[PDB]
Amino acid sequence: KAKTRSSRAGLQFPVGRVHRLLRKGNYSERVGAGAPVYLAAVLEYLTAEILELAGNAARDNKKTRIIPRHLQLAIRNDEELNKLLGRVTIAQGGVLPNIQAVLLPK
Amino acid sequence: TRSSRAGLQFPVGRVHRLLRKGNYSERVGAGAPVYLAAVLEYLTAEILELAGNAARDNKKTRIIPRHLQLAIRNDEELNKLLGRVTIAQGGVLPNIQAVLLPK
Amino acid sequence: SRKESYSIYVYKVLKQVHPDTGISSKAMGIMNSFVNDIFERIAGEASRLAHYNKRSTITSREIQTAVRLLLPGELAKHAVSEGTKAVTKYTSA
Amino acid sequence: RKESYSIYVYKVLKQVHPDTGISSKAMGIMNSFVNDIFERIAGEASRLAHYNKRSTITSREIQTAVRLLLPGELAKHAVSEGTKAVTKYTSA
Amino acid sequence: RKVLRDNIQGITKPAIRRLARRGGVKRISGLIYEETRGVLKVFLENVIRDAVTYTEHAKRKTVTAMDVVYALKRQGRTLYGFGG
Amino acid sequence: NIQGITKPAIRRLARRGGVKRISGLIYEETRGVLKVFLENVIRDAVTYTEHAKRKTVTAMDVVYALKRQGRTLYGFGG
Amino acid sequence: KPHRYRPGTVALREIRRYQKSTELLIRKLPFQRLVREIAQDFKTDLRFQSSAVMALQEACEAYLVGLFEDTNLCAIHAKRVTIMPKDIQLARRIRGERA
Amino acid sequence: PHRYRPGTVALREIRRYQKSTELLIRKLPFQRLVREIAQDFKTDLRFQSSAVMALQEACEAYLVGLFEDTNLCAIHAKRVTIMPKDIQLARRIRGER
DNA sequence: ATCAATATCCACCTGCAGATTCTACCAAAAGTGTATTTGGAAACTGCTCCATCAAAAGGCATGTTCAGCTGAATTCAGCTGAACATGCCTTTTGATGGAGCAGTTTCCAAATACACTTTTGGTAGAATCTGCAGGTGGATATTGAT
DNA sequence: ATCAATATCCACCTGCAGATTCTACCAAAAGTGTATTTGGAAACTGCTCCATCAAAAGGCATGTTCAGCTGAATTCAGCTGAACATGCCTTTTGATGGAGCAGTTTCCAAATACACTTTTGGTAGAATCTGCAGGTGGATATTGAT
Ligand SMILES: [Mn+2]
């Protein structure tokens, strides 16, 4: 039959859509062979990283549908992801519940 | 010379080659290489006329780094364009907080 | 007028880490935007090394070293992992 | 080999100020400058390309780009010298 | 339709207040309101300008979301959730 | 080693910076940010040297990651 | 009484509140209007995608809230507990938006 | 004997270094520092004498600029002496830490 | 505000070596001549998506008291960090050399680009589903007055 | 130390607007059999780059002193937060009309590919030259005392 390349690497993302968006992207004159794979991979991985951290957020909040907020929460709570998407903003995301201690009563 | 047809000092060809060899787009128009060369020129021109004045103001006749940095961070626009660029051997413009001064 | 997205693909990766969980449309949105961003940051960074190294072709090697530079901490350690692996699998058979 | 913008900055220096010359290190600063600005405009010019499903970087893509990249009157006068140079190269 | 004018005073004071609480501020100085507006206005201008420039370059008459998205990216306010 | 960057030298860097007076603690803290800086710049630069399959760190190597870091430098390569 | 909450008590209650939610605080119609006005004075007779406007609004609502934190962290730095123009202006300078 | 009042030198020191353009840190300990750090990244490395000016030119510019921003904070708190406190506020604002 | 006695900048002058600038020539491009492919401009034109109005309702924005307690102006003083003249060692620096090593080449075997042809996996509808938005109320704090 | 007075919580509810499935076409992966190049893998110069070696000279580290800057405690003029009430205008729902994206078609006017042909732009000597860099002599800027 026919082996979808994404299958050879055993990934979920489309390795071939990745090869194509790469070539016609002008990032370079000629595209390697495992380049489309390796990248689909990092992308798959990072995609399942912010996924899980957010699912839980749905669980923490007693909901089964992941919504923006959860994602925002997921990001701004993991030191590393918070970092990678520093200058990025999530439509509907909200902000982390944080009060400057000095302002609290006593 | 292609560049002469436009009366520019900067090399139009070099640019046309720098574009087709930059992975910028699949094919480059002819207007581009020129337009840019001129735009590149005009700006270096702007930076010099303004640094010349700088050098002449010091009593030197040779443009050093500091002569450039002065011209740059003193022109509101040039400071904007190069806001996130740092010049080696340039220093800062002499500015002291009034609150620090005596009286 | 058919326009694409990584929609199916994220979704596949969603039932994988959280079988009994589902994602909202707006979220799926926030998702496609992410993937595309990263996708640009990396290929774009690796695009630079090529020029920098007078190399005509972006291999899976550049991608990596592009990932090193672009990703922070373990995220990148664990990152390169899934990739080298994925590519070591691919080529093999 | 290993080419540079040197001659060009020097020629333009001798027009605005015939009596003046430049240092080495300063010549260098200037080199970096040209390079950078180039890169910024060619970049924003490439995006305009891809962005518009277009496949060719016209001069229209350089200009418009320079409107987004260059501030205030630094931009207008920039666009001018560009339209200029191009108007002249074309006729004859 | 009807002339648009002095609308920056539509960004009510109560709203600015709210916006500031989500920020964390507990006590708001008098002058703040006007200041904010000024700063908000300058924002929108830069962003809208750029965006439209993307509408004007695509030879369209309608400003699309991308148009907006694309520009917010130039100002590094990279936004997610509006067109990939 | 970092201790090579002497207190007086720091005061000078401070001076140009427009600082009139200086706490005694700064010095330790100043060195801190200084390390972190050089640390991030150099590493990103090395990666370049290394990816380049070379063993010596060129001017560019610095310049390049210097850009990747937002801090762009003129007069050292282009 | 009448039952009055001391000052500041409601302010904290508002912070916790709006920080738990995610709805755009500026009222939509005026924002929109303001958008067309500004854009009016740049290019005459334009059209706006329903989504385009929200995008703008989402981005602004955002900026300001974040500029508001930095501002706040500045007010604290000067022993105060009231944000001011003085505070806002510093923050934007350090930020470089107008150094 | 004649002693100069306090900080009068500080102002006379400030105008000086601002009127000058020479790296202040001492050239050898720095380069020394450079190699040390870089050595935790890769071994038996070599640098270009130039790459080191690059690594000193850069560093120093950040430091001078970081200071300007530290001043504007200390002044802002009614004070007139940059403290470790002033230095973080300025950094958390810029978006570094 | 002056008077004088330190210490300081700061012009004025001025001489040669590290540089700047000017020459004198070779490959590497840049520029032609011809001959090919193409991108995307112009002219329909189908048809969403956007602009405007209406209407009724209630959700806020305004504007006005009132006063709690935050910002700001004082006052006081412990003590930290600038100015110094001292004493000493680590940066400066000046070659000098041998060699680790960026860089050149010269093949070529392996990995890409190509050009078609089947063969799916993805995208854009409708058909079915079902989390969860919006209300409803008791249960708990959490406040603020006595 | 008590109690109202409110605002925050949390689980139960229940129709429906936003997914989740269910189903066909078709643009774009995949499979093949050529037609290139690309980028190392030995082979090897010339650099630049470590490292040793050897003296002064600032430049740094100390240890003395105390001027004046940063903090803590009061005080109060009054600014800004919390209510309340008044009624304006932002929502919400729906409907049209058509301006103007977008999807096709059709093709010149414009950009690309080789094979040569011309000059220019980068090097490494060869010929100047501007400051660096000292060195006084003259207000300048300071600081302490009447
Ligand atoms: Mn108007």
Residue numbers in the entry:
A (entry chain C): 13 to 118
B (entry chain G): 16 to 118
C (entry chain D): 32 to 124
D (entry chain H): 33 to 124
E (entry chain F): 19 to 102
F (entry chain B): 25 to 102
G (entry chain E): 37 to 135
H (entry chain A): 38 to 134
What do the paper's sentences say?
The H2B deletion of residues 1–24 affected the structure of the remaining H2B N-terminal region, in which the electron density of the region preceding the S32 residue was missing in the tlH2B nucleosome. Concomitantly, the H2B–DNA interactions that involve the K30 and R31 residues were disordered in the tlH2B nucleosome. The electron density corresponding to the side chain moiety of the H2B R33 residue was also missing in the tlH2B nucleosome (Fig. 5A and (B)). Therefore, the absence of the H2B–DNA interaction in the tlH2B nucleosome (K30, R31, and R33 residues) may alter the DNA trajectory near the binding site, and may affect the nucleosome stability.
The basic unit of chromatin is the nucleosome core particle, which contains 145–147 base pairs of DNA. On the other hand, the N-terminal tails of the four core histones and the C-terminal tail of histone H2A protrude from the nucleosome core particle.
